[PDB]
Structure formats: structure tokens, C-alpha cells
């Protein structure tokens, strides 16, 4: 090889970048590391892009100076069970098939594994692209580094000649859409307007042909999702998160006004031909809660339906790219606010929300969050070295693998066995309430066809359908959320007991109605 | 089983015991645990003992209520190399046979092993009783609990019919005498007057037939050596220690007057027929430096000779039970204060001191000692229990076995590997200097016969004999001291460098004199 460009020349038309670049810890880092802009420079004016310069979005673009963080970022935790289906007695949600009915998640919902695989896994999961995309080889499942280097080096398209979403295997679904990708990659960061709105400068939008968009995307969880590449400063880039914090007025910590003042997101808008195009959110502190909260939150990234009239809410509507940014007890109200539900249960006919990994919103208010602990403290701490610069690890994983750093540094009276035991006590307890919430909800769901077939009245079914909304929300939050209660045990406990209460109620109401109908 | 005695009835005559017993943590502990005094009570007067009560001196007498401490006390560290001779390229003093000459230690000087064996190893070492006492079987070498229960359960006497010290094997010596036993056992605590003086009330004294004494003795390092059995309070019982510290006013920390004020021995004297018989030294705090310094010090416990006139100093003289109570740099002067040396080197003719394990006097003034660390902090810490009362371990051993407790609790920036490495750095460095001090001293010694045979003058010989005393002292201190410099690395270094300097001077004078003599 690389030959530096004259950055001062760049600054002549890129004051917004200069202001970020010259002030930060990348002041000495030349644009050529991340951009090829020779023809751009030859052809541009301050008012005309000329040739579009290339922006290198590979995490490997950072590995020439930050190999340690890159290597950690690419690493694979073999102990994290790969491709393990949750609808399964060995996993999170043994009754998930009954509970979720014909939702796309019924086609496959595996447990999470290492970050390196996130784009790949998104592409190949059975629910996403109808089986269109597949590992080139079952051997490829191990290759975290190959995945980081580019999805398409390890997976393949069954039919590169067509772009339509269809099933290639009988038990697959085509739930993927362009919004999904925002939590898998930011390769498209310069090609996607804020919120995924259609925009003249945006190749890709909420309404794009997701198969064509998929083909343009390569790298998982880009290094620049958390670090501004020009200033180095901590940031978020995820549109829905900025929208929640800023546009919705909710603040960084919606349940703590002081903390929302202590931890700040400063939006920065970049323009195209003078029009607002894309945004980022500069953090005043490297708050991993927000960094991780770009993805580990409950969201819409899918069409749905309006609670008011059942009208479809398709990808063209911003509500299909939305963070609720709310705890489990506020979720129903948040969803009601945007007049939105995900799906109608196939058996019971109840409009339902569909819950996805609400780790941040669960973590809010927990003792750990109340005390200033962030996701990275337990999942992504600094390495420990007798004689080394102690950099931050970059592939988040269970604190079980690093108990001294993750727990024992703070809990200095405990042994590693005790700390793990405290984890398991909570997880076990919660999992037991999940099993009971599933038992009861499944009972209620199973009673629906009996009720309908015995001629139970719409009024009664409609009451149960209402209960089903809260029973479902207050169960699924917990199979969706991946800490099995650890992140907020009192909350998991209250919520799951609520789900069970609702479900028992619906069962009693169904039973009474069936017995009456039959009498 | 045991029936409690009427303590009050004892207290009528035993007023000092009452004072100690009723006020401490053994107030509820009946005399019958440690004494069988029925015939005594029936026969005693205010002044005559009458029938002698039995005192149970086994550590096992404490085990009924202090099992944890007893079990730890009896435990055996297998990794402490057993019966390993120091005069050995694999051990402390490869040139020891040259350096110590005809001294008794030349018959055997093994490295220390676990406390449980101390009395047995004293009885059976080749230098002690002419090989009279032997393990009943080589199998018995592992039996630490057996040894604690009584030496004579695991060892035997080659000739119970005679009491004279003589060799039963060709390469043994009969170095033992009754003073030795004070650092192996206190079974004889009621049978030995303070200092081992001949005394009407003492069955055993400095001048006793040691073989007869030996047969009267059973247990190692009795629990009551450090704990008063009546009050439970920390104490010492070793006469020569109390003599140094209290009688001679040298203080518990003779190099630190302020510390000697803060750590104190309060003498308590017990009489027999109204004359002073035995003493203990009650500690104001449980300072294990003083507890351990009952044994881990440099001492006389052997006949020797006067520096002034060469006259023998036999067991009758109190100097044969003496704690020098001096660091390596003050030792020569302390030996002069008692006009004493141990042996004449068989080759050089030099009067020499014989140095034995001066761990405490080495420890004085070390960084750790200065910061109030004690022997037990590194060698006998509390056990660590997740869920138990954490008692003190009671078989002292290398901190290598228990680094978290011994080192890493105070040195929390260090890993176990780092703390060991620091240990090894000092031991290696020190060992290196001991090997060089050996090389030079041996070279000096070996030159003496060449000098003598060349006709070198007594004046030159005498001057090199004076050098030998210090060359020896500043060498042997360190093979005697079992930490290989760790206890005081800067002192070991200065002193070993002094030994070397003296030896090189000695060699230079002998070489010059031999050269002149031959020419
Ligand atoms: C004026 C003569 C320019 C100079 C000198 C440089 N750039 Fe530029 N650049 C310029 C314009 C008018 C635009 C378009 C802004 C808009 O309204 O859209 C750009 C764009 C970029 C981009 C983004 C391209 C994209 O994918 O949207 C990059 C990464 C970029 N420019 C980099 C860049 C570099 C590294 C330069 C020095 C080698 C440089 N530009 C000079 C105008 C001008
Ligand atoms: C890697 C460490 C980078 C270096 C060094 C430089 N740039 Fe950059 N740039 C980088 C990325 C990954 C992106 C995508 C957007 C994001 O925020 O991550 C960009 C973007 C730009 C743009 C477009 C900004 C916009 O209007 O949307 C421009 C104009 C730009 N970069 C210019 C630029 C210049 C001039 C640099 C040398 C001073 C430079 N970049 C260095 C990554 C990296
Ligand atoms: C060398 C040519 C680099 C490239 C390519 C990338 N980074 Fe960098 N980074 C570089 C330097 C010399 C420094 C300063 C280090 C220091 O000691 O001050 C940095 C710093 C960072 C930081 C942290 C700044 C801090 O707060 O300590 C980050 C987060 C960082 N760099 C990120 C990063 C990313 C994401 C990159 C790929 C887009 C990247 N760097 C490339 C040198 C270089
Ligand atoms: C979107 C770009 C994400 C960001 C930002 C963070 N995470 Fe993540 N995480 C994400 C996905 C899509 C997955 C599943 C990946 C797959 O292929 O299955 C994960 C997974 C995890 C895990 C589990 C890893 C394992 O060993 O199973 C953890 C512990 C995790 N994520 C935590 C985490 C932390 C602490 C983050 C901030 C530092 C973070 N994630 C950001 C998506 C994204
Ligand atoms: C950010 C708000 C995300 C959105 C948008 C999408 N996903 Fe996601 N995904 C996210 C996280 C934090 C995780 C790990 C936690 C968990 O429940 O696993 C995931 C995980 C996946 C996985 C791996 C596990 C699995 O379900 O098999 C896949 C295959 C996946 N996600 C696919 C997927 C699809 C198809 C999406 C659009 C409909 C989508 N994700 C969006 C974060 C986010
Ligand atoms: C959000 C999920 C992140 C992603 C994506 C990347 N990094 Fe990171 N990085 C993150 C955190 C929480 C931290 C620690 C910040 C703190 O002050 O506590 C870091 C730190 C760095 C650094 C600084 C040195 C260090 O502590 O290791 C560098 C140079 C860095 N990160 C680089 C980097 C690279 C190269 C990435 C892609 C491989 C990358 N980061 C992604 C959070 C996140
Ligand atoms: C320490 C108090 C933690 C905080 C801070 C965060 N998490 Fe956590 N998480 C924690 C535990 C003990 C567990 C269970 C892990 C185990 O081995 O049993 C988890 C689990 C997760 C997971 C699933 C990981 C896995 O099972 O391998 C994820 C995806 C996760 N946590 C994410 C996450 C987020 C996003 C956080 C900030 C909002 C966060 N965790 C903080 C402990 C702690
Ligand atoms: C007065 C009639 C006494 C009574 C009542 C008890 N004891 Fe005694 N004892 C007495 C004398 C005069 C002596 C000699 C020492 C002295 O204090 O002058 C002793 C000695 C002992 C000893 C030490 C024995 C030894 O081997 O040296 C012990 C252990 C002892 N006594 C115990 C003891 C007990 C337990 C008594 C109540 C059962 C008791 N004594 C009563 C005088 C008298
Ligand atoms: C073990 C826990 C004991 C208890 C209970 C009692 N005694 Fe004791 N005693 C014990 C030992 C090991 C010794 C030897 C000396 C020493 O200080 O360790 C003694 C000594 C005595 C003596 C002799 C004191 C002297 O003049 O030399 C007497 C008189 C004595 N003990 C009395 C005594 C009484 C009356 C007790 C019940 C109240 C008692 N002891 C309990 C061990 C233990
Ligand atoms: C039961 C009949 C016991 C006999 C035999 C021995 N000890 Fe004891 N000891 C006993 C009790 C009930 C207590 C008090 C426990 C408490 O903490 O309240 C003790 C205490 C001690 C102590 C500790 C004093 C302290 O400062 O904490 C010591 C050092 C002690 N005992 C020593 C000891 C010895 C050496 C024994 C054999 C001679 C012995 N004890 C026997 C109960 C009993
Ligand atoms: C206290 C001042 C002691 C006197 C009196 C005696 N010994 Fe000793 N001995 C003492 C300690 C602290 C140690 C461990 C340190 C060491 O140099 O090993 C020992 C060790 C022994 C051993 C075992 C190692 C060995 O030398 O083979 C034996 C066999 C031994 N001691 C015998 C012995 C003899 C024969 C004594 C009178 C001449 C004698 N010891 C006195 C402390 C003390
Ligand atoms: C000196 C070399 C000792 C020998 C001989 C015995 N013990 Fe001990 N003991 C010693 C120390 C340094 C300590 C810790 C004191 C402190 O305050 O830190 C102890 C402690 C005890 C206790 C108290 C409870 C505990 O800490 O474990 C008891 C009950 C005790 N020791 C009993 C005991 C027994 C039964 C012994 C013979 C088996 C014994 N001690 C010998 C030092 C020494
Ligand atoms: C005289 C009764 C002693 C008392 C009081 C203390 N120690 Fe000792 N120790 C003594 C001897 C005679 C020996 C040699 C034993 C043998 O048979 O060889 C020892 C040995 C040790 C050792 C070495 C243990 C090993 O595993 O090799 C250590 C570390 C030691 N001693 C330390 C020590 C401590 C800390 C003491 C006070 C708590 C202590 N000893 C007292 C003799 C005596
Ligand atoms: C911590 C700062 C210590 C203090 C306090 C005491 N000792 Fe020590 N000792 C220490 C070390 C690191 C070593 C070397 C052991 C090793 O494994 O390398 C020793 C050694 C001894 C030994 C020989 C033990 C053996 O090598 O197995 C003895 C007999 C000994 N130390 C005795 C002792 C005494 C009596 C103490 C108080 C005067 C004392 N030590 C304090 C570390 C420390
Ligand atoms: O599909 S993702 O949100 O788990
Ligand atoms: O001989 S003793 O002092 O080891
Ligand atoms: Ca959702
Ligand atoms: Ca000596
Ligand atoms: Co599993
Ligand atoms: Co999931
Ligand atoms: Co050895
Ligand atoms: Co020795």
C-alpha cells in the first residue's frame, strides 16, 4: 504494498471526516488502509462524487495493525453447541413447536454460537432463505476465520441464476428480509439509508430483494460497528438503536434518566447530494451495553400486522425496522404504541408478538446493570497476561470460560465452582419455570381445537386469545433471551409466573366453556 | 472412657494452674484429658508430690477435641525428599565432607523432612546413636501418624540390655546427648530442669546417659510446645530460648527493641520442693517466629572447646545448651562472649564453629520479617474452606504447596508461577554462591597439608586458621539454613561473598608460603 494517499487532499472535500480523523487515535492511519480512492480523486469535485471510491469493510482491513483483536474476533468457541435446535428436550424450548405453530421459527431455531459465524448462520439457517444458501461442505462448519474473511468463501448459492425467495428444501421458510442483515453485518453501511428507507443514494433498502442483497454481503459484525474507523471513538451504527435512543426519545438507558445523561449517544448524519442519508451514534464512553445492544435486543425486522385492524405491515413500513427498547412488562405497551403484532397463532387464532433475544432489555434494572456492569465485563473482558499488553477479547462468550476475569475479580470471596454454582442455581430455577410456562401454554393451546370443535363461542375464544398474548409474551421472552434468567432472575421469575398464571386462566376458561358446551 | 476429676480439689494445691486454667479457653476442659492423678491426689501434700500423677504428653491427647489440628500435625509431605544426604551433588553441600572433616555431621547430615518424623529421625540418623536405633522395617519410613503416636512403635533398639553410646554400624557416630531432645520432643518437660541443670527433681539433665533418656521419649514437637495446655495461650517452653530472650534480656527480636516490646515472653516458673525447677514463656501474641524459633535456630547442644585455652566444655557446662541469638555477622562475637568453638578441623587445625539451621536469625531484618511476617504465614497458614471453620495447618512445609495462602494473598499481582520463579531466582543465585564458597574453602583446606608438608611456618598456618573460622562460618550458615537464601537473600549474598573472600585470602597466603618454602 500500500502507498499512502495525500489525506490533506481528501480533507479538501471531506471536512466531516477530517474533523473525526485528525483528532483521534487514527490521525496517523492513512485512508488507503480502508479506501481505494485514486479514480475518485481524479474525477471528483466538492459537488460531484465522480468515481465511487471503494471502502474496504473486511474486519481483516484492521488486522494489519490490530491482529490480536482480529484473531480473538475470529475465534470459535467449540464448546458452544453448534446448530442445536431449541425445539428439543435437550435445549431451551421443548414445546416450541406447539407454542410457535406455523411461525417461520418453527422451521429452525438453533441456539447462538460464536460471532464469527453470524452472517453465515443467518444465510444458511432453514428458516431464512428456503435452503438456498448452504455450506459448500459440512467440513466448513468449523471455519470461523473463513467466515470472517467472507461468507461466500465457505457457503454457496444453490441457484445463482435466480433471485427470488423460494424453498429449495421442503422444510424451510423464507423469513429473511433486508432488515435482518443489519444485525449480521454492516458491509452495506454506505449502501443503506438510515432505517432502510428507500433513498436515491441507497442500493439497498427494507424493500429490496433480500437474495440479491445477501449476495452483496460478506463479513460478520464489522469491527466498525462499535468503533468509528476515522476517530476510533466508541459508537453504534445500528439504525434502529439510534432511532430508539434518539428518535423515540427514550435515551440510552430508558429506565434510568440519570444514566441516560451519563451515557450519551450523539447522532452524526452523513449526507448524499445534500440529503440526509446515514447516521451513526457516537458514545461518550465505551459502553458495551449499547454496542452489544445493537443486536442483542428485541426488534421488528419482519412484516407483521396492525393490532387495530389486522392490516399487514409490510417491509415498506418503518415499523418493520424497530427496536421496542422496552422491558418485558412494557413490551405489550410498546407494541401497542406502534399498533403492531407479529403473527396470528395458527391454532388459537391469537395475535401474538414474536420475541427475539431481549438481552439488553432484560439486563436493564438487574443488580449487575444497576452497579455499572456491562455486557463486555462478563462476556468480553481483557485477556490476562503476566507480561503483555492486555487487550480486550473480541469474541464474546460465556463467563464460564473466564471466571476470574468475568466474576471473581468482583466477587473475590467466591471460588470458581461457587460462582458457577450461583449461575446454575438461577438458570436451573428459571428453566424450570420455562418448562412450566410451556406446559401450561401448550395445554391452553391444545385445548383450543377442543373448544372450537365443541362449539365454544367467539366471546370465550376471544378472551383466551387475549390471555394468549400475555401468556406467550411472558414465556417466549425467556426462551428468546439467552441467559436463562441469569441476566435478571427476579424479572424472569415474575414474568414466567405471570405467563403461567395467564395460561392457567385460559385453560380454566376453555375447560369451563367446553364442559358447558358439551353439557 | 474418661471420668472428670474434681478440678477444685486440684486447685487447692495447684494455684498457678488454677489461675491459668479458670481464665482461658480450656476452663471447661477437665484435667483427666491430660493427667491421671488419682494416686497423686490420695498421696500428695501442699509440698510433697506423693505418687507421681501421669501426664499424657501425646499429641493425640489433644485429638479428641482438636482432630483437624492433630491430623494436619501428623501429615507427611511425600515430596520432601526423605533421608537425603546433604554431602551430595544433588543436595545442599557437595563438598561437605572436605569442609566439615571429622565432625559428627560427616557420618550423616540429611535434609529435613516432615515434623511428624523429627524424634524418630533424631534417634536413627547415623551421627546420633551409633546406629543403635533403627526403624523396625524400611516400610515404616512413611508412617508419620505412627511416629506421632510414639517413636518406639516404629523404631527399635539394637541392644536393650546396654545403655552405653557405642557404634553398632561402622560409619556412625554417637553425637547425641540429652540437650538435642529439647528440639525433638517435650515429653520430658516435667523431668528436665530449666537448662538441663542437674536437679533433685529432674530425672534427666544435660549430663544424663542419652540412651536411657532416649528410651523415655516418644512424641515429636508436642502440641504444648506452642500452646499452654492449661490456659491455651501461645507460649514457648524451650529453656535456652527463654534464657536468651528473658534471662539475658536480649528480647524476642534482639535486633529490634521496639518490636521486642510489642512481642513478649512472660516467664512462668514452676517449683519442686520450693525450688525453681522449670520455666515457660507465655507469649502476649501468637508470634510463630518465637514458637518456631524454639528449634529453627543456631545453638549449642553438644560439648565443645574454649577459644581462650582450648579446654573442653562438656555437658556439665551450661554453654552446651545455648542459643546464640545472633545473626551471621554477630555470631563470631556471640561465640566469643561464651568463649566457645565446636571443633578443630581435622585437616587445617582451625578451631571452628558448627552451624545448624539459623532460620530465625537469618529471617531477622529480612523484608518479610520487617513487615511483620512470621514463619507460619508462609509455612503453616490457615486452610481455605468454602464452607468450614478454617483452622491452622499444623505440619509446616514449603509455601510451594500452598502458594495462594502463603504468597499470593499478600502478592496479588503475581501468579503462582511468578511467585515460585521469584523463589527459585533467589535460591538459584544463593546456591551458586554456596557452591563457590565450597570450592574456595575446599581449595583452602586441601592446601593445608601441602603447606604443612612443605614446612610452612605455624605463624602462616595460624593466620590461615583464623581465616578459616570466618570462611567456615560464612559458608556453613547457608548450608545449615534450609531456605537456600530465601529467608534473607541480601544477607546470604553478603555473607557468602565474605566466606569466599576469606577463603581466597587463605588460599593466597598458603600458596605464597608454600612457594617460598619450596624455593
Ligand atoms: C473533492 C474534489 C473531493 C476530494 C479531493 C475527495 N473526495 Fe471523496 N467524495 C467527494 C464527494 C463530492 C463525495 C460524495 C458525497 C455525496 O454527496 O455523496 C465523496 C465520497 C466519498 C466516499 C463515500 C463514497 C460512498 O460509498 O458513498 C469516500 C469513502 C471518499 N469520498 C473518500 C475519499 C478519499 C479517501 C479521498 C482522498 C483519497 C477523497 N475522498 C477525496 C469529493 C471528494
Ligand atoms: C479504516 C481504519 C479507515 C480509514 C483509515 C479511513 N476510513 Fe473512511 N470509512 C471507513 C469505513 C469502514 C467507512 C464506512 C462508514 C463508517 O462510518 O464505518 C468509511 C466511510 C468514509 C466516508 C463516507 C462517509 C459518509 O459520508 O457516509 C468518507 C468520505 C471517508 N470514509 C473518507 C476517509 C478519508 C478521507 C480517510 C483518510 C483521512 C479515511 N476515510 C480513512 C474506514 C476507514
Ligand atoms: C495501522 C495502519 C492501523 C489500522 C489499519 C487500523 N488501526 Fe486502529 N489504531 C492504530 C493505531 C496506531 C492506534 C493508536 C494506538 C495507541 O497506542 O494510541 C489505533 C487505535 C485504535 C483503537 C483504540 C483507540 C483507543 O481508544 O485506545 C481502535 C478502537 C482502533 N484503532 C480500531 C480500529 C479499527 C476498527 C480498524 C479497522 C477498521 C483499525 N483500527 C485499523 C492503527 C491502526
Ligand atoms: C450484531 C452485529 C451483534 C452484535 C453487535 C453483538 N452480537 Fe453477540 N451475537 C450476535 C449473533 C447474530 C449471535 C449468534 C451468532 C451465530 O452464528 O449463531 C451472537 C452470539 C453471541 C453470543 C454466544 C456466543 C457463543 O459462544 O455461543 C454471545 C455470548 C454474544 N453474542 C454476546 C455479545 C456481546 C457481549 C456483545 C457486545 C460485546 C455482542 N454479542 C454484540 C449478534 C451480535
Ligand atoms: C438484531 C436486532 C437482529 C435482527 C434484526 C436479526 N437477528 Fe438474528 N440474531 C440476533 C442475535 C443477538 C442472535 C443471537 C441470539 C439468539 O437468539 O440466537 C441472533 C441469532 C440468529 C441466528 C442463530 C440462531 C438461530 O436462530 O438459528 C440466526 C440463524 C438468525 N439470527 C437469523 C436471523 C434472521 C433470519 C433474521 C431476519 C428475519 C435475523 N436473524 C435478524 C440479532 C438479530
Ligand atoms: C462491539 C460488539 C465491538 C466490535 C464489533 C469490535 N470491538 Fe473492538 N472493542 C470493543 C470493546 C467493548 C473494547 C474495549 C473498550 C474499552 O475501553 O473497554 C474494544 C477495544 C478495541 C481496541 C482497543 C484495545 C483493546 O482493548 O483491545 C481495539 C484496537 C479494537 N477494539 C479493535 C477492534 C477490531 C480490529 C475489531 C474487528 C476485528 C473490533 N474491535 C470489533 C467492542 C467491539
Ligand atoms: C455478568 C453479570 C453478565 C452480564 C454483565 C452479561 N451477561 Fe450475558 N450471561 C451471563 C451468564 C452467567 C450467562 C450464562 C452463561 C452460561 O455459561 O451458562 C449469560 C448468557 C448470555 C448469552 C448466551 C451465552 C451462552 O450460553 O453461551 C448471551 C447471548 C448473553 N449472555 C448476552 C449478554 C448481553 C447482550 C449482555 C449485555 C446486555 C450480557 N450478556 C451481560 C452473565 C452476564
Ligand atoms: C495438694 C495435696 C495437691 C493436690 C490436691 C493436687 N496436687 Fe498435684 N502436686 C502437688 C505437689 C506438692 C506437686 C509437686 C510440684 C509442686 O507444685 O510443688 C504436684 C505435682 C503435680 C503434677 C506434676 C507431676 C510431675 O510429673 O512433675 C501434676 C501434673 C499434678 N500435680 C496434677 C494434679 C491434678 C490433676 C490434681 C487434681 C486431680 C492435683 N495435682 C491435685 C500437690 C497437690
Ligand atoms: C491437656 C489439655 C491438659 C489439661 C486439660 C490439663 N493439663 Fe496439666 N499439664 C499438661 C501438660 C502437657 C503439662 C506439662 C507441662 C506443660 O506446661 O505443658 C502439665 C503440667 C501440669 C502441672 C505441673 C506444673 C509444674 O509445676 O510443673 C500441674 C500441677 C498440672 N498440669 C495440673 C493440672 C490441673 C490441676 C488440671 C485440671 C484443672 C490440668 N492440669 C489440666 C496438660 C494438661
Ligand atoms: C476437649 C475435652 C479438649 C481437649 C482434650 C483439648 N482442647 Fe483445646 N480447646 C477445647 C475447647 C472447647 C476450646 C475453645 C474452643 C473455642 O474457640 O472456644 C479449645 C481451645 C484451644 C486452643 C485455642 C485458643 C484460641 O486462642 O483460639 C488451643 C491452642 C488449644 N485448645 C490447644 C489444645 C492442646 C495443645 C490440646 C492438647 C494438649 C488441647 N487443646 C486439648 C477443647 C479441648
Ligand atoms: C533446636 C535448637 C535443635 C537442637 C538442640 C537439635 N536439633 Fe536437630 N534439628 C533442628 C531443626 C530445626 C532441624 C531441621 C533443620 C535441619 O538442619 O535439618 C533439625 C534436624 C535434625 C535432623 C534431620 C536432618 C538431619 O540432620 O539428618 C536430625 C537427624 C537431627 N536434627 C539430629 C539432632 C541431633 C543428633 C542433635 C543433638 C546433637 C540435635 N538434632 C539437636 C533443631 C535442633
Ligand atoms: C508451634 C510449632 C505449634 C505446635 C507445636 C502446635 N501448634 Fe497449634 N497453633 C500454632 C499456631 C502458629 C496457630 C495459629 C495461631 C494464630 O493465632 O494464628 C495454632 C493454632 C491452634 C489452634 C487454634 C485453632 C486454629 O487456628 O487451628 C488449636 C486448637 C491448636 N493450634 C491446636 C494444636 C494441636 C492439637 C497441636 C498438636 C497436634 C498443636 N496445636 C501444636 C502453632 C503450634
Ligand atoms: C522443635 C520441636 C521444632 C519446632 C518448634 C519447629 N520445628 Fe520445624 N522442624 C524441626 C525439626 C527437627 C525438623 C526436621 C524434621 C525431620 O525429621 O527431618 C523440622 C522440619 C521443618 C520443615 C521441613 C518440613 C519438610 O517438609 O521438609 C519446615 C518447613 C519447618 N520445620 C518449619 C517450621 C515452622 C514454620 C515452625 C513454627 C510453626 C517449626 N518448624 C517449629 C523442629 C522444629
Ligand atoms: C515467606 C516470606 C517465608 C517466611 C515468613 C518463612 N519462610 Fe521458610 N521458606 C520460604 C521459602 C520460599 C522456602 C524455600 C522452600 C521451597 O520450596 O523452595 C523456605 C524454606 C524453609 C525451610 C526448608 C523447607 C523446604 O525446602 O522444604 C525451612 C525449614 C524454613 N523455611 C523455616 C522457616 C522458619 C523457621 C521461619 C520463621 C523463622 C520461616 N521459614 C519463615 C519462605 C518463608
Ligand atoms: O433471528 S434473530 O433475531 O434471532
Ligand atoms: O542437628 S540438628 O540441629 O539438625
Ligand atoms: Ca420481535
Ligand atoms: Ca551450633
Ligand atoms: Co446444548
Ligand atoms: Co434465537
Ligand atoms: Co532432594
Ligand atoms: Co541440618
Structure summary, number of beta strands of chain A: 13
**Helix coverage percent of chain A:** 25-40%
Order of neighbouring strands in the sheet with most strands of chain A: 5-7-6
Overall outline of chain A: globular
What name does the CATH topology of the largest domain in chain A carry?
Flavocytochrome C3, Chain A, domain 2
Q: What structural class results from the helix and strand content of chain A?
A: mainly alpha
- Global Rg of chain A: 24 Å
Largest sheet of chain A: 3 strands, antiparallel
Which chains share the greatest interface?
Answer: A-B, 4 and 4 residues
**What compounds are bound to the protein?**
heme C, sulfite ion, calcium ion, cobalt (II) ion
Strand content bin of chain A: 5-15%
The CATH superfamily title of the largest domain in chain A: Flavocytochrome C3, Chain A
Oligomer: part of a larger assembly
Number of domains of chain A: 3
EC number (chains A, B): 1.7.2.2
Binding site for heme c 4 (chains A, B): 69, 223, 226-227, 382, 392, 394
Binding site for Ca(2+) (chains A, B): 298-299, 354, 356
Binding site for heme c 6 (chains A, B): 110, 127, 180, 183-184, 482
